[PDB]
From a paper:
Hydroxynitrile lyases (HNLs) catalyze the cleavage of cyanohydrins into the corresponding aldehyde or ketone and hydrogen cyanide123. In addition to enzyme characterization and synthesis of cyanohydrins, we determined the tertiary structure of [name] HNL (DtHNL) and proposed its catalytic mechanism. The enzyme is a dimer and exhibits a Bet v1-like fold. We discovered a protein with hydroxynitrile forming activity unique within the Bet v1 superfamily.
We also determined the structures of complexes of DtHNL with 4-hydroxy benzaldehyde, benzoic acid and (R)-mandelonitrile/benzaldehyde using soaking techniques. Clear electron density was observed for those ligands bound in the canonical binding cleft of the Bet v1 fold. In all three structures, the aromatic moiety of the different ligands is bound in a hydrophobic pocket formed by the side chains of Val44, Val48, Trp47, Val51, Val52, Phe71, Cys73, Ile108, Phe111, Trp138, Leu160 and Ala164. The polar parts of the ligands (the OH-, carbonyl- or carboxyl-group) are hydrogen bonded to Tyr101 and Tyr117. In the complex with (R)-mandelonitrile, the cyano group interacts with the guanidinium group of Arg69 (distance 3.5 Å) and the carboxylic acid group of Asp85 (2.9 Å). The latter interaction requires Asp85 to be protonated in this complex structure. The observed polar interactions between (R)-mandelonitrile and DtHNL suggest that the OH-group of the substrate is deprotonated by Tyr101, which is facilitated by the additional hydrogen bond from Tyr117. A water molecule bridges the OH-group of Tyr101 and the guanidinium group of Arg69. The negative charge emerging at the cyano group upon C-C bond cleavage is very likely stabilized by the positive charge of Arg69 and a hydrogen bond from the protonated Asp85. Specifically, Arg69 and Tyr101 are directly involved in the catalysis together with a water molecule.
Author numbering:
A (entry chain B), B (entry chain A): 9 to 184
The structure:
Amino acid sequence: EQFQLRGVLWGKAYSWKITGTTIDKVWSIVGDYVRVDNWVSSVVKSSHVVSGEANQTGCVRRFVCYPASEGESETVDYSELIHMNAAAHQYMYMIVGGNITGFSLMKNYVSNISLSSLPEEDGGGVIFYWSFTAEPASNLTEQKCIEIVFPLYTTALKDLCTHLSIPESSVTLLDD
Amino acid sequence: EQFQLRGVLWGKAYSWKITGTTIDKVWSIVGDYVRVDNWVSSVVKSSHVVSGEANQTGCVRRFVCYPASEGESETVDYSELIHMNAAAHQYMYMIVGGNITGFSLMKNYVSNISLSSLPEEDGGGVIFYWSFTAEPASNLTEQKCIEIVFPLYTTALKDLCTHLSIPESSVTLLDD
Ligand SMILES: N#C[C@H](O)c1ccccc1
Ligand SMILES: N#C[C@H](O)c1ccccc1
């Protein structure tokens, strides 16, 4: 009959329905964690594993982002895979270093990606779940976090369509 | 150009499609965090807020579970709401005390619930997302965690149907 209080978190979860593809085609792009340059190509220039075994839990990827706007420099993200279940199409990662624009402002940014199949008997389709949390910090606000994260996720879903060779109309953000 | 390694996590995410209901109806049961006795009523005997304000971020619920078997005592869960966004039908909580069977064995059990509406042109329906993580510890394995958690989530989806007065066939586990 005792408990230990802890601090609250910031964050938000998003889900999209994607038609016209399959979960394992989506996963071939989205699940190749250390090669995120092959996914979010509107943002990421290059990417490679720098610690551990590629796409195995505990590994760290380092990726380079194009300048956020002209005149700016390239920035770098280090992120650690902290959970991976490839057969269940889901994983979890955290930013552990770098100066990547916006994202490096957050304290303990953790993200979850989980792909699910809608029932074949209902016409199929893929649900793409993507969430983040961050720890509240004096130098930021939850609204700022969401302003940083959501445009990136939106860009990434667009880039996904490009790499799957399906129209952008294939993706629909679900009402929460 | 440096980074610090962090520990990895155990866990799993699950998604169900629920037909014959609306996100508002589901939320009226699932979203009443401190009254989980009015949701998972086959497992939970009673539930009350014991710190903070009911269903506001930071609050702690105390709930009591029926005995696992005859002669066994009731067990107790303390869990803190660490994120709540009711407008977006999503929240996150962690066990912060108690001796609730199985769940109290995990180190830093954290759970996320999200509800999404499928497009009306598709026939509507709700996607129910539910995930957990726990920290690796000597006295458990990830498999043992999954064997604690998934049967409870399954029971909870069944109990949800009872309270919604809809048949269990309304619920389909995605990727079953
Ligand atoms: N780490 C991390 C972020 O989620 C991220 C940022 C840019 C492109 C892909 C992913
Ligand atoms: N806290 C917590 C667990 O997720 C839980 C355990 C039993 C019934 C409802 C919820």
